[PDB]
Write a protein that binds this ligand. Structure first.
Ligand SMILES: *[C@@H]1O[C@H](CO[C@@H]2O[C@@H](C)[C@@H](O)[C@@H](O)[C@@H]2O)[C@@H](O[C@@H]2O[C@H](CO)[C@@H](O[C@@H]3O[C@H](CO)[C@@H](O)[C@H](O)[C@@H]3O)[C@H](O)[C@H]2NC(C)=O)[C@H](O)[C@H]1NC(C)=O
Ligand SMILES: *[C@@H]1O[C@H](CO)[C@@H](O[C@@H]2O[C@H](CO)[C@@H](O[C@@H]3O[C@H](CO)[C@@H](O)[C@H](O)[C@@H]3O)[C@H](O)[C@H]2NC(C)=O)[C@H](O)[C@H]1NC(C)=O
Ligand SMILES: [Cl-]
Lengths: 214, 605, 214
């Protein structure tokens, strides 16, 4: 019931700024002790900043001091991270967490901040159809988008097992591309079709491409 | 000071045995009259107890129990009054001293005790104790029926030496020659409640207790009722006679003495007494001195927040989710606050949910507690006691365990954050076993206490030498190195200037975001219509008439955004129409209407 | 500052094994240590706090012990879903600091991949670029070898691979290979084949399709 739902990530140009929200339910942020933690792609966890809003104590890592402002609005029950003068090495997945005992018990889902000069590109989704077994595979191809991430689910989250969504690959063009497959009985083709739900938030694209045996 | 509080912990095992004796020591060092119960319990063998040596008089009961120490030096104790009794029957209770070279109380040595006014004596299970059976208790008692409430066990693990050869008739409090029992009642002439000898001329004044040195009411060893500056009297001072004599006016009855004015933390009554609690139909007004007084309500008495040990919560032992809402919006609680493990775990026997952390918000308005604050459990989410951010005084008129006005134990908060706390009226503070807690020794307790007989007792918190880095010691900008927690928002006193809650190096007087003036070490914003000045003062106050120069137009004497256009400063005043200069000063319009005027004039009036 | 150092960097263990992970504080850090479990691309999950105590809902397998400055997260018998990176964290000194992490990988028996071949979508053909997808489904160990054949011509430097994170039930990987070709070089050819070499394969698997002809 105690939850942290954070938002505000996405794409920013170098030198530009961005603000991250961390909305709480199940507890008061004001009396609590909120911490921000980042994780550059393929790296360890790194502490960034913290706030005890009631006491007024705000703390920052030498890495981000003077660029970042931590704050909290009590009425909204939300903690914020204002990030200014962003650079390449700020590109990471930022988490917010709640201090407890002497650890962080409740964490946010983590939002992705990507600092790049390239502009936002929407993905085009292409079907991967089975041919003429016992068990056969089908899926979608989410090609040419920027930046990360893309969310692929099947039949509005109703179909889960058999599903493999591959981690995206950086292409020569600088754009991303991934594939998402699923295996199903070879006697289900025709009278049972499946819909993949592609969602690229930065570009506002919600494609529902139904894959059919052809 | 000579008058001190007692304790009220009975046979309960000490909450921190490490600093239990230190409690006793601070409490009784120099004390002569114990306004309550003298409880000397759980004292280890080597225990240094010389701080008791001035106790002369006890109001409540004397309870000497569960000690391994061989003697308690209470030689100057003359009288126990028994205003309160142990187990509702006993004025002196000496219980379980020594296990069932060897430990245990050997002698009582109450060589001066000659009056127990109320209740009996209970002496039991003291394997090393000698001579208690020797004492003629009847003499010490005020009335004979007090004998009927006396039980004196003589089971013993050792042979006793005889009383000193110099002892009257084999009655003593110990092996010493000055340990003989002095009889002041059963040995008397004629009437006489107390005598200094067996002749009629050896009677003590009607108003003495314990005995005397002569016949006058100034020769008393103790006052039976009240001590009026060295004269024992039946009453504290409606005149019948046409004259005036010495001995100052009228007095307040405080304990068993008449005094000029009530002591520091007490309350004077219309009935002419000092108290720690007002009667019904009564408020509590603070004089310009800081003096408190109970007085009848002229209207019906207004709403009052009662804490624990008061009104409907007099039996309730802790703040739970059942009564947390009762403190909503309270600026001043009349009673105490206690947070126990059972507060946040929640008793599953009664349908009482565990109290949630954000429910402690109710206490955000709180400024004053008359009783005590006790915290033995706190939510693991909360790093500090910031919900008590605004608490200014804890009077301690009611003390937890009869001794402590502020107790913080077993918490695992990292800092305190009680940043408005300026006064602990009376009692000791105890902060122990908070393994994570720093900023305990960065607080100037010397300034929170009032009398110099109170102190902080601390043990098993985070080591002092381990509170050193950032987030662990006071901020640079805190004055005199005093703070309630980390950062420039936790200073006790501010080294330079305050911008709201924060300690800052400089106000934006000459340079900065929005310009500021200083007022009483406070950074405060200039009016938006002030024009920022190059390396010079921008404004002198918050009002738009206090700018050095205007950012836009000026409308004497104000710096304005635009010149008045048909505004009326109030009703019945005709509207004021103006236009700007080439310079920027707002100028009045000419002849009324047709050309209603503005810069180059407009119709429609 | 203060340094948390974990050992080993990575470890591989079979299901049921007694895994232990060391974390070493540079100075005395008291009992104030926490252990986290982070699955790839999700929030860290708290396991142990205050060195010894384990958080609610955490299975009996996870335990923590302290000896001086040497802290030991230890899993009594490893389970297939325990694949993650594990981080220790200290709380005694400020700022709080993390260990560099320990990646724990699951060892299992050799499993042959299920191979599938997907033809470039009809919709995508009306764009001027074609993507040919090859799927290696549910296999172990990781190192496979995919090779593309366009009319029996071995392709080079024009395809990219992506590996699934180890499945939390049967600990198998999945692989996707993608052949990116222009419409021109795709319409010049007819028979498209994907060639797979794995330890579970006695001989290479090949899956084909005949462009618009069957
Ligand atoms: C002097 O002490 C004796 C007991 O002798 C010993 O020292 C004590 C301090 C304890 O440590 C004892 O365990 C030890 O034996 C006291 O005698 C006891 O008195 C009680 C009544 O007060 C007798 O009642 C008994 O109670 C038990 C348990 O409830 C029942 O099983 C019995 O049926 C019986 O009713 C008891 O018999 C008696 N103990 C002995 C040894 O028989 C004595 O009270 C004490 N004197 C004074 C003045 O306090
Ligand atoms: C009744 O109460 C009065 C208080 O008005 C007591 O008189 C005070 O008692 C002290 C000690 O007996 C007297 O002597 C003085 O003591 C102080 C402190 O020890 C010492 O510094 C002085 O040199 C002096 O010897 C003094 O008369 C008086 N003290 C003061 C300051 O008021 C009286 O003791 C009490 N009597 C009974 C019957 O209990
Ligand atoms: Cl002793």
């Amino acid at each position: 019931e105690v939850q942290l739902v954070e938002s505000g990530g996405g794409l920013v140009q170098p030198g530009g700024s961005l603000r991250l929200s961390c909305a709480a339910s199940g507890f008061s942020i004001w009396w609590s002790w909120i911490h921000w933690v980042r994780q550059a792609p393929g790296k360890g966890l790194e502490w960034v900043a913290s706030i005890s809003p009631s006491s007024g104590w705000t703390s920052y890592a030498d890495s981000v001091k003077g660029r970042f402002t931590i704050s909290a609005d009590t009425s909204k029950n939300t903690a914020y991270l204002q990030m200014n003068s962003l650079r390449a090495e700020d590109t990471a997945v930022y988490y917010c967490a709640r201090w407890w005992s002497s650890a962080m018990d409740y964490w946010g889902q983590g939002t992705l901040v990507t600092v790049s000069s390239a502009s936002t590109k929407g993905p085009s989704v292409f079907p991967l159809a089975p041919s003429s077994g016992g068990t056969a595979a089908l899926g979608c191809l989410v090609k040419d988008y920027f930046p990360e991430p893309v969310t692929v689910s099947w039949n509005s989250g109703a179909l889960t097992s058999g599903v493999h969504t591959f981690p995206a690959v950086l292409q020569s063009s600088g754009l991303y591309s991934l594939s998402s497959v699923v295996t199903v009985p070879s006697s289900s083709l025709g009278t049972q079709t499946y819909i993949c739900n592609v969602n690229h938030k930065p570009s506002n694209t919600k494609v529902d491409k139904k894959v059919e045996p052809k | 000071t000579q008058v001190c509080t007692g304790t009220d912990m009975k046979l309960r095992l000490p909450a921190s045995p490490e600093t239990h004796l230190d409690m006793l020591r601070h409490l009784y060092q120099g004390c002569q009259v114990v306004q309550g119960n003298l409880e000397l319990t759980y004292l280890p063998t080597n225990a240094s107890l010389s701080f008791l040596q001035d106790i002369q008089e006890v109001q409540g009961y004397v309870l000497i129990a569960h000690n391994q120490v061989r003697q308690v030096p209470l030689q100057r104790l003359r009288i126990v009054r028994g205003t309160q009794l142990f187990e509702d029957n006993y004025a002196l209770a000496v219980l379980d001293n020594g296990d069932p070279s060897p430990g245990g109380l050997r002698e009582l040595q109450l060589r001066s005790l000659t009056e127990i006014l109320k209740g009996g004596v209970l002496i039991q299970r003291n394997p090393q104790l000698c001579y208690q059976d020797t004492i003629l208790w009847k003499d010490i008692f005020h009335k004979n029926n007090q004998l009927a409430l006396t039980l004196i066990d003589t089971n013993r693990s050792r042979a006793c030496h005889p009383c000193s050869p110099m002892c009257k008739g084999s009655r003593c409090w110990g092996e010493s020659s000055e340990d003989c029992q002095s009889l002041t009642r059963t040995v008397c002439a004629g009437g006489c409640a107390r005598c200094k000898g067996p002749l009629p001329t050896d009677c003590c004044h009607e108003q003495c207790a314990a005995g005397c040195t002569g016949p006058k009411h100034s020769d008393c060893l103790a006052c039976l009722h009240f001590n009026h500056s060295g004269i024992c009297e039946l009453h504290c001072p409606n005149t019948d006679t046409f004259e005036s004599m010495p001995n100052p006016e009228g007095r307040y009855t405080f304990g068993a003495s008449c005094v000029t004015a009530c002591p520091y933390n007490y309350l004077s009554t219309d009935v002419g007494s000092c108290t720690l609690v007002c009667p019904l139909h009564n408020q509590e007004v603070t004089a310009e001195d800081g003096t408190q007084r109970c007085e009848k309500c002229s209207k019906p008495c207004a709403r009052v927040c009662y804490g624990l040990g008061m009104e409907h919560l007099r039996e309730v032992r802790a703040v739970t989710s059942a009564n947390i809402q009762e403190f909503a919006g309270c600026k001043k609680i009349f009673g105490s606050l206690a947070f126990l493990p059972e507060s946040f775990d929640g008793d599953p026997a009664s349908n009482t949910a565990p109290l949630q952390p954000e429910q402690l918000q109710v206490f955000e308005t709180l400024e004053e507690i008359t009783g005590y604050l006790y915290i033995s459990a706190w939510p693991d989410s909360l790093p500090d006691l910031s919900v008590f951010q605004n608490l200014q005084v804890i009077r301690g008129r009611i003390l937890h365990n009869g001794a402590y006005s502020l107790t913080l134990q077993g918490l695992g908060i990292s800092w305190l954050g009680l940043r408005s706390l300026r006064e602990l009226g009376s009692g000791l503070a105890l902060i122990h076993h908070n393994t994570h807690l720093c900023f305990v020794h960065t607080v100037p307790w010397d300034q929170l206490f009032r009398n110099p007989h109170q102190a902080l007792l601390h043990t098993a918190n985070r080591p002092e030498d381990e509170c050193v880095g950032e987030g662990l010691a006071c901020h640079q900008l805190c004055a005199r190195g005093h703070c309630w927690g980390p950062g420039p928002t936790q200073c006790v006193n501010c080294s330079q200037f305050l911008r709201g809650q924060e300690c800052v190096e400089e106000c934006r007087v000459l340079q900065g975001l929005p310009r500021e003036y200083v007022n009483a070490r406070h950074c405060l914003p200039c009016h938006p219509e002030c024009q920022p000045q190059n390396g010079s003062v921008t404004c002198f106050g918050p009002e738009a008439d206090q700018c050095v120069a205007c950012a836009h137009y000026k409308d004497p004497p104000f710096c304005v955004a635009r010149c008045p256009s048909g505004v009326k400063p109030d009703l019945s005043y005709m509207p004021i129409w103006k236009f700007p200069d080439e310079e920027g000063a707002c100028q009045p319009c000419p002849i009324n209407c047709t050309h209603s005027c503005v810069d180059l004039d407009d119709k429609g009036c | 500052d203060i340094q948390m150092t974990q050992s080993p960097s990575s470890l591989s263990a079979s299901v049921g094994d007694r895994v232990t992970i060391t974390c070493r504080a540079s100075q005395s850090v008291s009992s104030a240590v926490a252990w986290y479990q982070q699955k790839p691309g999700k929030a860290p999950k708290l396991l142990i706090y205050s060195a010894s105590s384990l958080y609610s809902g955490v299975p009996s397998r996870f335990s923590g012990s302290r000896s001086g400055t040497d802290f030991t997260l230890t899993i009594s018998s490893l389970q297939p879903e325990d694949f993650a990176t594990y981080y220790c964290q200290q709380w005694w000194w400020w700022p709080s600091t993390f260990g560099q992490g320990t990646k724990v990988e699951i060892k299992r028996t050799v499993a042959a991949p299920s191979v599938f071949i997907f033809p470039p979508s009809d919709e995508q053909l009306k764009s001027g670029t074609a993507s040919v997808v090859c799927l290696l489904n549910n296999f172990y160990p990781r190192e496979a070898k995919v090779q593309w054949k366009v009319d029996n011509a071995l392709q080079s430097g024009n395809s990219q691979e992506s590996v699934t994170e180890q499945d939390s039930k049967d600990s198998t990987y999945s692989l996707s290979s993608t052949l990116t070709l222009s419409k021109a070089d795709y319409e010049k050819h007819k028979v498209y084949a994907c060639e797979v070499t794995h330890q579970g394969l006695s001989s290479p698997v090949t899956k084909s399709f005949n462009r618009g002809e069957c």
